Design a protein around this ligand. Structure first.
Ligand SMILES: *OC[C@H]1O[C@H](O)[C@@H](O)[C@@H](O)[C@@H]1O[C@@H]1O[C@H](CO)[C@@H](O)[C@H](O[C@@H]2O[C@H](CO)[C@H](O)[C@H](O*)[C@H]2NC(C)=O)[C@H]1NC(C)=O
Ligand SMILES: *[C@@H]1O[C@H](CO)[C@@H](O)[C@H](O)[C@H]1NC(C)=O
Ligand SMILES: *[C@@H]1O[C@H](CO)[C@@H](O)[C@H](O)[C@H]1NC(C)=O
Ligand SMILES: *[C@@H]1O[C@H](CO)[C@@H](O)[C@H](O)[C@H]1NC(C)=O
Ligand SMILES: *[C@@H]1O[C@H](CO)[C@@H](O)[C@H](O)[C@H]1NC(C)=O
Ligand SMILES: *[C@@H]1O[C@H](CO)[C@@H](O)[C@H](O)[C@H]1NC(C)=O
Ligand SMILES: *[C@@H]1O[C@H](CO)[C@@H](O)[C@H](O)[C@H]1NC(C)=O
Ligand SMILES: *[C@@H]1O[C@H](CO)[C@@H](O)[C@H](O)[C@H]1NC(C)=O
Ligand SMILES: [Ba+2]
Ligand SMILES: [Ba+2]
Ligand SMILES: [Ba+2]
Ligand SMILES: [Ba+2]
Ligand SMILES: [Zn+2]
Ligand SMILES: [Zn+2]
Ligand SMILES: [Zn+2]
Ligand SMILES: [Zn+2]
Lengths: 446, 445, 443, 445
């Protein structure tokens, strides 16, 4: 009796070799359980053999079906399952259980075998950090032991493992499966077996390939958005973004309780939102230094610069102090008092709700902002005509600004108050640099 | 019992859910409560973080097992009560008597209106997946209903609720009863009432104006997902969710003469048929006014002779015309120069396949009337192009001398005289009396 | 027909709870299961993180609400099945069968043994809070019983289990049935048998011996907290959980002659009585050894005359002795100079004008020796307390003394001691028991 | 009557609870009053036998129902006034003034000092569960406090008080404000003063001595029970409540490189770090004086580079030594022949798990400093046994020629030269700027 169920999820309705795939596996064992899975019934018809061991799983709700019909485990009776991509074929007999023998004998949860197509499976490293909304891929140091595969491969694992994932068949499965299994610390072993390719392989023409790649990329972009992957890095570079940008809204809505939505989801600030924050801070600092306005890193930005030289990973804005008597030297700021100002490079310069301060937004739509806090000396004390509850929003000795010091921050060099360690612990408390904490720990703590 | 209060219908930007949950907890501190949501609501719902009040997030997540998004694993009780936002438990023991109403009656669901601005009404409902249609009406035998509309607390067994394919699809008021009515289950509307919230949600006309449109949006996304194209009510009102002149047609290009919907064991979507009928009416009027001799052909004439309308699985309309008449019509003469978009958006074209014409409903919607030009030979109507259809043949011209009226698709159309033998000559004997799919070798009736 | 599996008895260092929970999830993936612990078990239990499997922590915490430690809040079903570690579901439908039994039968608890090395046997059990005692025995009406010994899956209604005062106190095998037998509930021990775990915990003799060590510690703490100082068995076996030679006595100093335990509607703790009985025995033996003649006095004589033992709420033992004999015994001529700790731990003191022998330097349960001397045939002394029964009496009541069983040994009492007792206490005192101070609190 | 006087802090053997309860009943005979105790107080209190005075026994009992041990069962009013023994109501309406003040303001607790020898004073309090620490100090925003020191009547809503986990744990003056400060609640110290009992309790030195011994005993058990290992006053006058040289360490054998405190959503106990800093300091003092070449290694060097101290969730200290230098240290060269306890109770032993040495804080407390022998082979620093740790690597010996002073855990220790590049090699780029706990792959995250 068979112990593996072949499962086919990656194929296009408009052009596939799924009939050849299924028929190749049935030729080695006519009782072989085989499942083709789809979100809608594929048209043109697949016209698979109408036998009981060949079933087609429709994985979307229907008014006339029971809950079990859209659950893929309903269709698998065996202990193991083989994810076969379209374009693969079974020509050598018995490979399906050399893969189970290797899986049982080995130390990894998944075993894989390349399919001999134009894109044969390559072994990858993969780190998923939901806190940073990032997947980081690279070359696999312990190959053939991988975190993820790229390319065409049959993947075999226990049905109990595959169907306890939250998105077991989400598309592209080559992306979704290894994001789930890598995050669990599971490994996949690229076995030295090769599956033959379809005799007449699918998407032969350039135009067929072009439509398949366009829909695939669309599915991949929706997948990463749905799962909260905003940034995909390969070896730290070749950055692929899936978050906000200059034309969109920012990822998180209006903050309430000084606790943004991402903290309630046990994540930190989305990397697109940090990337836009760094870009805006440099732009503003560049403008102020060209205009001759004395600025200095303030609040959480100074604290992030003093600790690790960047925006704090869970912070949502950038804060700068400025000398009030310098506001006139900036075109953007002197216009910000009369009304909103969109400058030549799309940044919006505004005077605030109330609180006598200046916000500079990344764009008209994306409200990630640098806040500018103007102070004026008052007997050697820096003061403002307004305040907010926050502990670190206080007056302070002006001598902390008499010299200003370079301080690396967010990929450039900015000005900070002299002896910034002491000035930070005045506003925040002793030990702030060495003990990181969330904006509102009474609501949410690290 | 041991009913789990299950909250699904609410908006994250403006709701009454904390006061809802608090009200039930005041009657029973340990009352099991499950709030369901697709994504974690922000700003925070701020429910009591006590073990009997749980929040079930129905989204996929990379760090959660399959069970975390399946709501039946949050419900351990035998009965489950769907409570809408804006309701409230004042009179203690109200759930307890709903359960004993269920065990006594024969209905699988029992229901209690909520005294809000729109308490639940008792309705009838038939669902016809084959025709993509749900028909609501006034309840024949209230307080027994197929469905409800308005705010109600609905109690049923968890095994029954969670054996449905989409138990908590939104809006629940639409989704649940579509699934239960199709199964022949009844909902019993009881003589009990739940109170409204003291501060009901959506107090301002603007928030009262943001819910409906995401509601109407969610409702249209639901009916499309479940294959409901048309909703009708007693009173004649109709709500569409399919084609129109500004979209594409519902189904893609047809392979093997067998459209995709037939493989799904459905027939032609009601919006496609209805575009076809109003396109056939319009083209017939253009051709009559132009002095082009036309007659119903193929499946159109076959459906006319059966019941005076399009064959319910058919995907286009066919008319034959005299080839020597094409010049009489303005749209047909532009067609042989190129594609023509006329006064009311219909698209006239000379076809690439054969030597015939095609009239599309609109630029984006390629439901069409095909015009098959014929010319006489020695009393035999012929054309120079042919399809691999059995009914695509020549025929004696006397069948056209004269034409006879024949009701079709809501209007009177010209048909060949003696159309029974005409149809039998083209289709084979007994065609009128023996309906069959376009390609029985691939998919038969 | 919905049951929550509830796991409470396991050791964090060696358990089979993962196999237990998995086996029930083999029969139903949505089976509700609550694992209950006082602190977070480490090493980690590695349970599935699915909504129908929840780990409930019963101890208070600065960052959790009151509800978080109340276990009824984790259980929404009608029925509850306490399942001990080492058990596992193998047959299907086993908990519905138990549920059918419960509704069909008349017992509020139903139980099926686990096929471990200690399958549950039935047991009788009376609980006497007044006497701080629980008595076990063999069950006459088995399978209808008061308590169980060994491993079983117990099923009852959640409303029954969680209205008990300590529903999950450990060991639950001891704690649960003390509470249900006290209420008069019976447990029915069914035909059926749950299978044992395939890799059962406590494989090594070292591991078992650590589980039994801390299991004995929890049981002692349980009984002490719940007012059970003595566990006795048919056959005579005794388990003590009270005071001894090296502790405090169980109650503080007495005010208004009414000990604390009486205000709790309880009588003298049985360990305190035992201490008094062995001190009376030892002190009598010492006085007899030294030729000092003694006689039961006060409440000791009353209790001896009434039933041959200490009055069950009394807190000391009283002996009259002849003054002129006081020099005969070493311990007491020593007690006149200062406090004397003898070669067996007893503490002889002089105080009043009477002598006191304490059980030990830490345990101040005492025998009071009242020396009497004859003045013209009347037994009198020089200092008097404010008790009716503290009076002179004719010496002929001691000429001669008679043997009277008391506290496990044969004591010496005045002759015609019923008339003697009626002299000091008043008529009918033997057959009309009364608390030491009825003005404050009556019996 | 909307406030229930609750009396919890008193001693059975010496108290003025009778005077306390009678003072309030003279102001209003109906005044709801609850005296709460673990066991029946003896000598008997002899409180008035009326329905509005009730004694609550909070311990579980074999005979009583669950409700009897729940303090909310004994209170049916909206507010509760916690009144300490020694306090006394002399002017009418003081409880009703505290309510109008409680709802006018923004703090959830109000308090009035009692005119004893120890009237309540305003305190600051921060509660760090992850650091198992309770930091006290003078109250910057007085009279708005986080906590109180001394005797006050404290009034709050019963729903607030009785929803905390340990609402009446003793000493209340500590347990309550630990729970309320952690929730970000404030208490406002009002200008109202409750009088002292005419016969104050514990009026002798001996009565006070016994009361203080029990007080300190209950406070010590309360803090360990709630995981407060260290109490501070303005960063000083510390009080420890965790492990030490005479006990076992706080967590015990670490499986999967993940200690128990991580799963409890906390970091390393402060007593366990203090022992580690002490052992590291003592060990390098022995190594420098014995002529042993050492350098910070692993997470100790990383912590020293990041913030100059032990990483707050780390559980030992690691040092690289030169293998050939071991003979120079007497403690080390005794460790191979068997485990060795030295003059100061530190325990030097060869490794169970590999070929390295380990210095434990004491024979009972196994917080330890690991010492890793490396020998020079062909210019690279390498040992022969290895761990499946990522940072257990061979490294070039130039990193040790020379060595650098780096602050660490309160003293100055030796680190490799260019330790940033050193750390980056075995941990990865950005390691100093991007922290993470030891093995976050469990999926219990
Ligand atoms: O079961 C606890 C102890 O009980 C009796 O003393 C004996 O059974 C002992 O064997 C046992 O103590 C264990 O003894 C071993 C070797 O003698 C120690 O290694 C072990 O300590 C742990 O050892 C591991 C390495 O295997 C780690 O070094 C770990 O850091 C260490 N844990 C502690 C807290 O020292 C010891 N077990 C315990 C719990 O101390
Ligand atoms: C993956 O993560 C590990 C652990 O932080 C790190 O050492 C490694 O360099 C990472 N690899 C990639 C390709 O990001
Ligand atoms: C998850 O794994 C368990 C095995 O522990 C198995 O019983 C269960 O069926 C699995 N779930 C699915 C959906 O396959
Ligand atoms: C539903 O169908 C029944 C039977 O076909 C019919 O009698 C009834 O009129 C229909 N109701 C509606 C509202 O269409
Ligand atoms: C329980 O009580 C009855 C008295 O009514 C007694 O006969 C029986 O022996 C007691 N059981 C035990 C075990 O002593
Ligand atoms: C106690 O019993 C009552 C009566 O059945 C019930 O309502 C209540 O929930 C029980 N308490 C529990 C289950 O904690
Ligand atoms: C408590 O924490 C706050 C955080 O802003 C800090 O300002 C204050 O100094 C801290 N107080 C103590 C006593 O630690
Ligand atoms: C806790 O607060 C809730 C708020 O809904 C209240 O119903 C409940 O009674 C409170 N708990 C107690 C023990 O008072
Ligand atoms: Ba900030
Ligand atoms: Ba047709
Ligand atoms: Ba006596
Ligand atoms: Ba370390
Ligand atoms: Zn973003
Ligand atoms: Zn349509
Ligand atoms: Zn005792
Ligand atoms: Zn410690």
């Amino acid at each position: 009796g068979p112990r593996v169920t072949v499962l086919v999820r990656e194929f296009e309705a408009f052009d596939n070799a799924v009939p050849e795939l299924v028929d190749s596996f049935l030729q080695q064992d006519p009782a072989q359980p085989v499942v083709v899975a789809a979100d809608t019934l594929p048209y043109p018809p697949l016209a698979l053999p109408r036998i009981p061991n060949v079933r087609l799983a429709l994985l979307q709700p229907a008014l006339d079906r029971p809950a079990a019909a859209s659950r893929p485990e309903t269709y698998v009776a065996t202990e193991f399952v083989a994810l076969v991509p379209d374009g693969a074929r079974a020509e050598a007999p018995g490979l399906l259980e050399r893969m189970v023998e290797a899986l049982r004998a080995g130390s990894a949860r998944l075993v894989a075998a390349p399919v001999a197509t134009a894109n044969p499976a390559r072994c990858l490293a993969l780190n998923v950090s939901l806190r940073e909304w990032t997947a980081r891929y690279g070359a696999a140091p312990a190959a053939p032991r991988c975190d993820a595969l790229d390319g065409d491969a049959v993947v075999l694992l226990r049905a109990r493992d595959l169907f306890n994932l939250s998105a077991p068949l989400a598309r592209p499965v080559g992306t979704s499966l290894f994001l789930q299994t890598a995050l669990r610390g599971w490994a996949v072993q690229l076995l030295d077996l090769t599956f033959a390719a379809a005799r007449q392989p699918p998407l032969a023409t350039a135009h067929a390939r072009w439509k398949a790649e366009r829909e695939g990329r669309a599915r991949r972009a929706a997948l990463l958005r749905a799962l909260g992957i905003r940034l995909v890095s390969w070896e730290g570079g070749r950055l692929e973004w899936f978050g906000c940008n200059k034309e969109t809204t920012r990822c998180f809505g209006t903050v309430v309780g000084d606790t943004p939505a991402y903290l309630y989801e046990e994540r930190w600030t989305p990397p697109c939102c940090l990337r836009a924050l760094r870009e805006t801070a440099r732009y503003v600092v560049g403008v102020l230094e060209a205009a001759g306005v004395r600025y200095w890193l303030e609040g959480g930005s100074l604290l992030g610069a003093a600790r690790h030289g960047d925006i704090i990973p869970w912070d949502y804005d950038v804060d700068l102090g400025i000398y009030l008597e310098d506001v006139g030297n900036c075109e953007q700021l002197r216009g910000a008092e009369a009304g909103s100002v969109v400058d030549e490079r799309g940044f919006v310069w505004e005077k605030a709700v109330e609180g006598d301060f200046f916000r500079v937004q990344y764009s008209e739509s994306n409200h990630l902002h640098v806040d500018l806090w103007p102070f004026y000396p008052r007997n050697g004390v820096m003061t403002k005509d307004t305040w907010l509850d926050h502990r670190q929003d206080v007056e302070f000795p002006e001598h902390f600004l008499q010299p200003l010091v370079p301080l690396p921050f967010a990929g450039f060099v900015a000005q900070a108050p002299n002896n910034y360690r002491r000035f930070l612990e005045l506003k925040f408390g002793p030990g702030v640099i060495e003990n990181p904490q969330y904006p509102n720990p009474a609501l949410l703590s690290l």
